[PDB]
Subunit: 144 residues, 3 copies
């Protein structure tokens, strides 16, 4: 491992592929985790993929990254993107971990509330509406 990355997916993203196929595509959460894992293996990057529906469990996981040698975070906060100032403050508290925000869907084409990101101002980049390949694009930003 030249680099250690944590990928966080927020609430509901464990239901990728099996539900709302017209918004987030046909490929499921297991596909996404395995695609990430295999890409990172090919680049000699150590990766952990983590998902939770709990705001507090996401914060706890971000705090643990401060103590375990994490270099970078890829995060899709899901619906928490649009209101969780607590997750924003958790990201700000790990100022020397690089962070990339990812959204699968084109959020600017959906409900007005999805246009707001309270997390983006404390991150180091954002990828929107590129589908599951947005996670690979984020890893490459971290690895560059």
């Amino acid at each position: 491992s030249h680099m250690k990355i944590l990928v966080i997916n927020g609430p509901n993203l464990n239901f990728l592929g099996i539900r709302e196929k017209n918004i987030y595509g046909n490929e499921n959460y297991e596909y996404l985790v395995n695609m990430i894992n295999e890409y990172c293996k090919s680049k000699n990057i150590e990766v952990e993929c983590y998902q939770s529906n709990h705001e507090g469990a996401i914060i706890d996981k971000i705090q643990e990254a401060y103590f375990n040698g994490t270099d970078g975070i890829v995060i899709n906060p899901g619906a928490y993107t649009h209101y969780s100032y607590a997750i924003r403050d958790a990201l700000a508290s790990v100022s020397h971990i690089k962070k990339i925000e990812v959204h699968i869907s084109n959020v600017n084409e959906r409900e007005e509330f999805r246009h707001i990101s309270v997390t983006e101002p404390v991150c180091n980049g954002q990828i929107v509406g590129q589908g599951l390949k947005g996670y690979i694009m984020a890893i490459d930003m971290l690895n560059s």
Copy 2:
């Protein structure tokens, strides 16, 4: 059981009756659960009543309804009605489960923030300010 229903109550609604009697009435959470249970028994409806203060535990419970043959959901999200886009997205993710939103109090007579429901647009009906009998009215909408 011709039909299986899940009733979800959100944060603070376990303190019904013992607190804020002038807003939500004199009858407690135990009364509400037993009233639901007994009504459903009389109509040959299988019902589970669930309460949590945790946003993430409510989402987890909604996800479990996708796999256990639930037909309908009655939900009072409590204060999460006014801001939890994560609970809205959980309800949207179970598109073939019918959903009815319930509020005990007349929310339109209270603080301005209580006028907003982020969950109502993904439900199949809403009952407001009818007191505890609003839950029975919701079950009858599901059973019709």
Copy 3:
């Protein structure tokens, strides 16, 4: 004990001192807990200091204060100050426990979202931008 107090700190405040030193100062969460503990001991006040990143765990802890003889609550909700109507409703549900809101930083000098407190209207006083000594000032309001 002439009086029993619960001090609640919300998300991220366990990272006091080690992170964001220019915003919240150089002294850490362990320092704050011990300073509180020792002050209360000197005044014959029984105190418990509690922290969690979980909104639902904070609500659960507030509910438990209704049954264990708590007289007063000092609360710094952290980022939840700016949006958690569920924590506001938990505080309102314990109407005979006195409550003081504390913020370490001068929130009126920071991002616009930090100017909003959804919890302050159901409390009995607020202390802003006095640093860690704001917690001692809150205990003295409760003890007066």
